[PDB]
């Protein structure tokens, strides 16, 4: 009956496409055509951080917009003070191959993960005075690509096993598993209300998941691997930067592809995607060794950072919008303003 | 202008930087290697050989030192077939060790395809490959039987003659070496099809009982270091 199931699936996919086209009366560019452009957005490298020894694969800001954690292939997880360049912590990882780092909203814990398939959660507010591995979540069957905190006790982790997981840290078990993707899930963004999250994978498709219920609400379709994903500040849209030199903006309430940010002179791959606080600026890091700032509504380039010697592997905008931190494969983080 | 606490924080940062400089010296003095191969290929045998004689976990590490030079060799398990996404973590490894089972001709063609994918990879475009054509005691026992001819799997073998070059000095049947050199050339051609800096393939013939694999790796890595010295320091 596999033929019958495949035919029903094809008919349902065609119905989804027809319904999605029935709501595309106007395109985002048409509505945005009247509002004035941002103009040149020139941001200068204020503070540069020179502690790591190898390529930086991830960063994450803290909710205080002051501290930030960076993970390097040298087996180090450095918690930096942005304002003073001071190094607050230097956690030595048990595995040197780290692809993701997360800073808990409370500032107490910091998460790392990579080829070891383990999500290592480290405690920073211990009475002993040294950072210790609080827990090691060890249920994945593939490399960790992204970990984000929901609170001090729950984490969400995307892995190369085509599955995402929601872990209760104290129990150490996968509370929920998300099992829709057909390829390596490479990025992950958590909604501001922390009830939904979008995951981008190598199947050229993003998927929106309900954390509480475990299901996949809706799937958005790109023509290469989606390497970065980030919600709009609204919580009703998100952006996916992929291996083809495109960052696409989708909207949940319409189940569409609102805009496609691309340029004929960009042939590299987007590694990281972030939004400005207003949501009007979409910052994307590229293999071209530089970050491009797009206008998220007019779909035109607004600026170029261009201060790195190797590919920009991580990007993050603070909660207060003061700074955009870029981490590249040259062991340097740069705080642009 | 800094406060007392700010000065203490700066001093703590300088202490962290000192430990980071020590870790930098340790990280530089060690050579990272990546070990690839198929399940058929004898690959855990090689890690055992260079360990003894010198769960769902993903990365396996096998440290070993040769002539006071430390090597960290990484094997990647508990990962699926797709490799294009975690292979980027190995842009800076000194050498990629590829183990190909020369005994099995049926799976040989896909071994060449994996080698081609590794060789022509945008991230390993500057990464040398040390190639181990493993399980050759089984190759001799297979070619001295006549029940499996390479022509049944590689049609070009019938028109191949051993080159007027090196030969195994000890007693080896002159068509054992013909087949072995054909397997070698099938990889050497792919290596020389698209060559660049730091991108050179070192082919070696090995077995499970062989205890000299570590010396081979050390010599090849020394040559890789010499080439990077000749390039990054403008000598070529």
């Amino acid at each position, epitope marked *: 009956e596999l033929d019958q199931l495949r035919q029903e699936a094809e008919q349902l996919k065609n119905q989804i496409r027809d319904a999605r086209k029935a709501c595309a009366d106007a395109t985002l560019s048409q509505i945005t055509n009247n509002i004035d452009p941002v103009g040149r957005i020139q941001m200068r490298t204020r503070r540069t951080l020179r502690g790591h020894l190898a390529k930086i694969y991830a960063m994450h800001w803290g909710t205080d917009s002051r501290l930030l954690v960076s993970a390097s292939q040298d087996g180090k997880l450095i918690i930096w003070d942005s304002y003073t360049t001071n190094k607050v912590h230097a956690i030595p990882l048990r595995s040197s191959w780290v692809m993701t780092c997360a800073y808990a909203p409370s500032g107490n814990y910091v998460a790392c993960g990579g080829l070891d398939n383990i999500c290592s959660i480290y405690n920073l507010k211990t009475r*002993e*005075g040294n950072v210790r591995v609080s827990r090691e979540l060890a249920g994945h069957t593939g490399y960790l690509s992204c970990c984000r905190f929901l609170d001090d006790n729950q984490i969400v982790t995307s892995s190369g096993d085509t599955t995402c997981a929601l872990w209760d840290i104290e129990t150490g078990q996968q509370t929920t598993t998300f099992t829709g993707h057909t390829g390596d899930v490479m990025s992950l963004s958590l909604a501001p209300d922390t009830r939904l999250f979008v995951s981008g994978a190598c199947d050229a498709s993003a998927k929106l998941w309900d954390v509480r219920e475990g299901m996949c609400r809706q799937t958005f379709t790109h023509e290469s691997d989606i390497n970065a994903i980030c919600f709009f500040p609204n919580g009703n849209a998100f952006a996916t930067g992929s291996d083809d030199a495109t960052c696409r903006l989708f909207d949940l309430r319409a189940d569409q592809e609102l805009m496609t940010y691309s340029h004929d002179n960009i042939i590299c791959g987007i590694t990281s995607v972030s939004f400005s606080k207003s949501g009007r600026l979409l910052l994307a890091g590229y293999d071209d060794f530089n970050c491009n700032v797009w206008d998220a509504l007019k779909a035109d380039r607004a600026g170029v950072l261009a201060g790195h010697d190797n590919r920009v592997s991580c990007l993050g905008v603070t909660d207060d919008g003061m700074a955009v931190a870029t981490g590249s494969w040259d062991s340097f983080l740069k705080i642009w303003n | 202008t800094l406060s007392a606490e700010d000065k203490a924080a700066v001093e703590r940062s300088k202490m962290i930087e000192k430990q980071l400089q020590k870790d930098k010296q340790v990280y530089r003095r060690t050579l990272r290697l990546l070990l690839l191969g198929a399940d058929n290929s004898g690959k855990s045998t090689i890690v055992k050989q260079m360990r003894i004689y010198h769960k769902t976990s993903g990365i396996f590490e096998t440290k070993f030192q040769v002539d006071k030079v430390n090597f960290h060799m990484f094997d990647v398990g508990a990962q699926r077939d797709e490799r294009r996404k975690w292979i980027q973590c190995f842009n800076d490894v000194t050498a990629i060790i590829f183990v190909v089972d020369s005994s099995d001709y049926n799976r040989l063609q896909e071994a060449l395809n994996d080698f081609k994918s590794i060789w022509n990879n945008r991230w390993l475009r500057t990464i040398s490959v040390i190639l181990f054509l493993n399980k050759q005691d089984l190759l001799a026992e297979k070619v001295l039987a006549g029940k499996s001819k390479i022509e049944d799997y590689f049609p070009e073998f019938a028109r191949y003659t051993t080159p007027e070059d090196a030969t195994p000095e000890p007693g080896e049947d002159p068509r054992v070496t013909r087949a072995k050199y054909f397997i070698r050339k099938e990889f050497v051609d792919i290596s020389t099809a698209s060559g660049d800096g730091r991108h050179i393939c070192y082919p070696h013939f090995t077995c499970s009982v062989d205890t000299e694999n570590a010396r081979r790796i050390f010599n090849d890595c020394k040559d890789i270091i010499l080439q990077m010295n000749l390039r990054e320091y403008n000598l070529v």
Partner: single-chain antibody
Amino acid sequence: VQLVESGGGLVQPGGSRKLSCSASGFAFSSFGMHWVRQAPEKGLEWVAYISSGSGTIYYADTVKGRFTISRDDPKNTLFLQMTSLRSEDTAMYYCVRSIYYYGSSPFDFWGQGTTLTVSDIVMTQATSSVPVTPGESVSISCRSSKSLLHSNGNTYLYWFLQRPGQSPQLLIYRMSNLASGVPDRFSGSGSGTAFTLTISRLEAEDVGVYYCMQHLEYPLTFGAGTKLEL
């Protein structure tokens, strides 16, 4: 965390004595270490400070030259070598743990102290004794001759509590933050040169002497301390 100090006793004036505090239960090598003292019936007075890595040592004016502070990190023990003692140096000496980074709380743990008997941002706390009854809010005020609001943004005031017959315990660090393990009823507020600690719904086992300590510039100055009695 545990931190036990020993080496006290009777010293004839002009002698020399080595106090040693052994720290067990935390990363001693990554914490700065202070030596403070309390006279037989007086307030706290900072003596010395040895930084992590032994790269920054500070002494008090009434202490410089006579006293040498040092630490043995592998053995996890800090030593105060006191030379040419005087009658004014008799005190219970406390060894104070203190780490320094962004968000850190210095002066968390205090030792049990060693009794030794020998045979400047002035901080004033006018209330030397405030009568109190359990269940009522209390306010202890401290002033300073120099504003503690540094240009970075944070004021470096520390509120300590010393229960009868016990070592001082940190209550508030940097004038608004609450220490780890202290009840939420304690609150700190104020501006430079004027600070107030408010205990809402005082409950016994919080009576004792309350001290205010400045950390803007060395030497660190304490206060007389308000004595809350039930």
